Design a protein around this ligand. Sequence first.
Ligand SMILES: [Mg+2]
Ligand SMILES: [Mg+2]
Ligand SMILES: [Mg+2]
Ligand SMILES: [Mg+2]
Ligand SMILES: [Mg+2]
Ligand SMILES: [Mg+2]
Ligand SMILES: [Mg+2]
Ligand SMILES: [Mg+2]
Ligand SMILES: [Mg+2]
Ligand SMILES: [Mg+2]
Ligand SMILES: [Mg+2]
Ligand SMILES: [Mg+2]
Ligand SMILES: [Mg+2]
Ligand SMILES: [Mg+2]
Ligand SMILES: [Mg+2]
Ligand SMILES: [Mg+2]
Ligand SMILES: [Mg+2]
Ligand SMILES: [Mg+2]
Ligand SMILES: [Mg+2]
Ligand SMILES: [Mg+2]
Ligand SMILES: [Mg+2]
Ligand SMILES: [Mg+2]
Ligand SMILES: [Mg+2]
Ligand SMILES: [Mg+2]
Ligand SMILES: [Mg+2]
Ligand SMILES: [Mg+2]
Ligand SMILES: [Mg+2]
Ligand SMILES: [Mg+2]
Ligand SMILES: [Mg+2]
Ligand SMILES: [Mg+2]
Ligand SMILES: [Mg+2]
Ligand SMILES: [Mg+2]
Ligand SMILES: [Mg+2]
Ligand SMILES: [Mg+2]
Ligand SMILES: [Mg+2]
Ligand SMILES: [Mg+2]
Ligand SMILES: [Mg+2]
Ligand SMILES: [Mg+2]
Ligand SMILES: [Mg+2]
Ligand SMILES: [Mg+2]
Ligand SMILES: [Mg+2]
Ligand SMILES: [Mg+2]
Ligand SMILES: [Mg+2]
Ligand SMILES: [Mg+2]
Ligand SMILES: [Mg+2]
Ligand SMILES: [Mg+2]
Ligand SMILES: [Mg+2]
Ligand SMILES: [Mg+2]
Ligand SMILES: [Mg+2]
Ligand SMILES: [Mg+2]
Ligand SMILES: [Mg+2]
Ligand SMILES: [Mg+2]
Ligand SMILES: [Mg+2]
Ligand SMILES: [Mg+2]
Ligand SMILES: [Mg+2]
Ligand SMILES: [Mg+2]
Ligand SMILES: [Mg+2]
Ligand SMILES: [Mg+2]
Ligand SMILES: [Mg+2]
Ligand SMILES: [Mg+2]
Ligand SMILES: [Mg+2]
Ligand SMILES: [Mg+2]
Ligand SMILES: [Mg+2]
Ligand SMILES: [Mg+2]
Ligand SMILES: [Mg+2]
Ligand SMILES: [Mg+2]
Ligand SMILES: [Mg+2]
Ligand SMILES: [Mg+2]
Ligand SMILES: [Mg+2]
Lengths: 159, 137, 204
Amino acid sequence: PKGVSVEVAPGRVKVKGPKGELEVPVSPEMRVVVEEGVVRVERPSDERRHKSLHGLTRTLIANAVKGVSEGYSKELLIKGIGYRARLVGRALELTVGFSHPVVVEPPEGITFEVPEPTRVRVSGIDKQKVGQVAANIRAIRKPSAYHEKGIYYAGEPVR
Amino acid sequence: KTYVPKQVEPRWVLIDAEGKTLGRLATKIATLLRGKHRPDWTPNVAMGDFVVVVNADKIRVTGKKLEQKIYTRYSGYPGGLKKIPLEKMLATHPERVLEHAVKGMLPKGPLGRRLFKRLKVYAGPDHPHQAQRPEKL
Amino acid sequence: MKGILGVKVGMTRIFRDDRAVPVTVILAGPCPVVQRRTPEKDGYTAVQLGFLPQNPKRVNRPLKGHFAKAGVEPVRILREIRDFNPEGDTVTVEIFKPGERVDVTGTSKGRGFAGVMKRWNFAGGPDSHGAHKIHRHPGSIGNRKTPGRVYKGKKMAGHYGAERVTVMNLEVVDVIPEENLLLVKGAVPGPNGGLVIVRETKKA
RNA sequence: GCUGAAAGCAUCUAAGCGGGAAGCCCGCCCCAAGAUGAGGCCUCCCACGGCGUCAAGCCGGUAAGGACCCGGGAAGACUA
RNA sequence: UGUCGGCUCGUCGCAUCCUGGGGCUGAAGAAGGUCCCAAGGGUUGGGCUGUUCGCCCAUUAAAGCGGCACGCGAGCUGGG
RNA sequence: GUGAGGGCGCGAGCGAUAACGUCCGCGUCCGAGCGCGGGAACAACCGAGACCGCCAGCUAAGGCCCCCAAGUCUGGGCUAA
Ligand SMILES: [Mg+2]
Ligand SMILES: [Mg+2]
Ligand SMILES: [Mg+2]
Ligand SMILES: [Mg+2]
Ligand SMILES: [Mg+2]
Ligand SMILES: [Mg+2]
Ligand SMILES: [Mg+2]
Ligand SMILES: [Mg+2]
Ligand SMILES: [Mg+2]
Ligand SMILES: [Mg+2]
Ligand SMILES: [Mg+2]
Ligand SMILES: [Mg+2]
Ligand SMILES: [Mg+2]
Ligand SMILES: [Mg+2]
Ligand SMILES: [Mg+2]
Ligand SMILES: [Mg+2]
Ligand SMILES: [Mg+2]
Ligand SMILES: [Mg+2]
Ligand SMILES: [Mg+2]
Ligand SMILES: [Mg+2]
Ligand SMILES: [Mg+2]
Ligand SMILES: [Mg+2]
Ligand SMILES: [Mg+2]
Ligand SMILES: [Mg+2]
Ligand SMILES: [Mg+2]
Ligand SMILES: [Mg+2]
Ligand SMILES: [Mg+2]
Ligand SMILES: [Mg+2]
Ligand SMILES: [Mg+2]
Ligand SMILES: [Mg+2]
Ligand SMILES: [Mg+2]
Ligand SMILES: [Mg+2]
Ligand SMILES: [Mg+2]
Ligand SMILES: [Mg+2]
Ligand SMILES: [Mg+2]
Ligand SMILES: [Mg+2]
Ligand SMILES: [Mg+2]
Ligand SMILES: [Mg+2]
Ligand SMILES: [Mg+2]
Ligand SMILES: [Mg+2]
Ligand SMILES: [Mg+2]
Ligand SMILES: [Mg+2]
Ligand SMILES: [Mg+2]
Ligand SMILES: [Mg+2]
Ligand SMILES: [Mg+2]
Ligand SMILES: [Mg+2]
Ligand SMILES: [Mg+2]
Ligand SMILES: [Mg+2]
Ligand SMILES: [Mg+2]
Ligand SMILES: [Mg+2]
Ligand SMILES: [Mg+2]
Ligand SMILES: [Mg+2]
Ligand SMILES: [Mg+2]
Ligand SMILES: [Mg+2]
Ligand SMILES: [Mg+2]
Ligand SMILES: [Mg+2]
Ligand SMILES: [Mg+2]
Ligand SMILES: [Mg+2]
Ligand SMILES: [Mg+2]
Ligand SMILES: [Mg+2]
Ligand SMILES: [Mg+2]
Ligand SMILES: [Mg+2]
Ligand SMILES: [Mg+2]
Ligand SMILES: [Mg+2]
Ligand SMILES: [Mg+2]
Ligand SMILES: [Mg+2]
Ligand SMILES: [Mg+2]
Ligand SMILES: [Mg+2]
Ligand SMILES: [Mg+2]
């Protein structure tokens, strides 16, 4: 929680940092206890319903802090002969097998890059934004259940 | 020989809306539309307050009602039953929700219709600032 | 959103390159904008087009005052094209260029009290093997005790035609500014000498 | 499928988010203000002339306008 | 309270025949199997028999099932 | 006069531990109490046996958020469908 700038509102919480800042709407019936060089969260009870809500806001904010701490990002392996990505301007266009080569928009708050036609990272301040866009690309061509083609993460082949 | 009331005068009200529970609000509202709060009350006459609601768009409702609570509406035609979820209503013309909720709690006779006109519903707030705007809660 | 009034004159055919093309001759005669319709004080956007000149003898109506409040020659007929704000003067067949495509409205021919046979292209019954008093008749129209009534919509004999009809996506073949003629692909409602509005399509 | 707790892990879910059907809502064509909750815009006409004091009425004349009648119509049973 | 079948006109259900979407597959691909979502619309012509039903000929995206007094005789037919 | 009875609870046969089915036994209500309150409506389920009158009063079942009389009553739990 260094160089961070937490804050508090009715339901949400702010988190400022080198990277920027993000809204972090969180549990209403929860405590957003701000300390010196640290934050915190406290639940009004010990119910089955309460427990679940606690940990969420716990992590949720921590990732918010982590987001502006350094920022998230993810790999992307392009297997298969033709298949290969190409960063055109801000946006990613990548061929794979469709006669028409797919082009992908560059969403706000996210910045992907092709360090090589067989690699694509996706840098972002939001663990959420990161997560979707990652899969979005993989979706463009799931892994071939019968071979080894199309997008992949850092997870084993399908085979 | 019981007292029969004479020609009174409309008492306009002005109810809020935001936060208030749909059902619970309607309840009170109608009991104003009928005079049933005013001791000088009488069935056959019709002399309840001119209720005016504002910011009905901000009516709250418990549970999954926003999704589950569907309205029906049967056009005379075949397959003409057209249903509509609470969401969609509040999206589009919202006062509509509060309107019927009340309507459904007014007596079913002609003056029951007469009583409905007495209700002016909105979402702004701000009505046509006639004269009386005696806020209530 | 282009739009312009006209009258169906009749129809024949012309030859594109070396292949014949059936066409109806609309006449989108000069139309003076008589009033603009803005949200500011109308709630919606549109343009009151006028069409066809008129002798002030019938215009005795204070309509003269309407035409006056816009300095226009009193026309005979005027209808609005919606969501179409031109420039402050007069529309021509010129709004349309060859190759464009148009939707066209008109009042279909009046077929009066129609037989269900024609009104709804039914099929009635046998010209032969019996009954003989039910040839062009509709047959059953319901069921027993349940429902016990008839659907609001039931196709039954009645007034057919003389209704409002819009036909979609006609291509504007030719346009002769010389004499105010629109040339479309034939199929257009109303009878000759009939009134008809014409506008841009919805291919997109 | 993302982010994610209860439940140190894991989970598409419980808070929340994205993807997703000839289907739903709209969009397209027709009707539609008897939508008595009778809408709206442009223009035109405009005071009493006589009984009703008080009140909403009543009477013959009026305006802008309309109607009747007649000649007709790809409108039409009739009417419109 | 007229009874089968046909004819006319249909309309509703969905336990889906086709087209749309999806998981699994003993899914390489193509094709198929099976389950889940999904009525919007579609669901042919003839031979035989009173027929319903069914067999058959030639096609189809498919030639779904069922409710509506086994819908429908103040609509028709009248082969049974 | 009646010698078609009917439903409900209970106890049996028949029935298929089906039927607004049937056949006996005990009771009951309708029949004849389709008069009154409750149950949305409804012979026989719950309440109750209408001599007539009253712009009086207590209660029965049931009910007291609005249509609809009367508590959005008090206190302690549970349920998120
Ligand atoms: Mg760093
Ligand atoms: Mg990094
Ligand atoms: Mg990186
Ligand atoms: Mg980086
Ligand atoms: Mg307020
Ligand atoms: Mg929602
Ligand atoms: Mg239905
Ligand atoms: Mg529809
Ligand atoms: Mg207002
Ligand atoms: Mg005028
Ligand atoms: Mg239009
Ligand atoms: Mg439009
Ligand atoms: Mg022009
Ligand atoms: Mg005969
Ligand atoms: Mg004969
Ligand atoms: Mg005959
Ligand atoms: Mg005969
Ligand atoms: Mg005969
Ligand atoms: Mg019949
Ligand atoms: Mg009926
Ligand atoms: Mg020119
Ligand atoms: Mg000229
Ligand atoms: Mg994944
Ligand atoms: Mg996590
Ligand atoms: Mg456990
Ligand atoms: Mg975890
Ligand atoms: Mg959720
Ligand atoms: Mg979206
Ligand atoms: Mg979506
Ligand atoms: Mg219209
Ligand atoms: Mg109109
Ligand atoms: Mg309305
Ligand atoms: Mg004068
Ligand atoms: Mg005077
Ligand atoms: Mg006087
Ligand atoms: Mg005449
Ligand atoms: Mg005539
Ligand atoms: Mg299904
Ligand atoms: Mg099946
Ligand atoms: Mg399918
Ligand atoms: Mg395959
Ligand atoms: Mg499959
Ligand atoms: Mg025989
Ligand atoms: Mg066949
Ligand atoms: Mg059928
Ligand atoms: Mg049967
Ligand atoms: Mg049957
Ligand atoms: Mg039959
Ligand atoms: Mg007969
Ligand atoms: Mg018959
Ligand atoms: Mg028959
Ligand atoms: Mg014979
Ligand atoms: Mg024979
Ligand atoms: Mg015979
Ligand atoms: Mg006996
Ligand atoms: Mg007995
Ligand atoms: Mg007895
Ligand atoms: Mg007995
Ligand atoms: Mg029994
Ligand atoms: Mg007795
Ligand atoms: Mg009774
Ligand atoms: Mg009952
Ligand atoms: Mg009785
Ligand atoms: Mg009784
Ligand atoms: Mg008392
Ligand atoms: Mg008591
Ligand atoms: Mg009690
Ligand atoms: Mg309590
Ligand atoms: Mg309690």
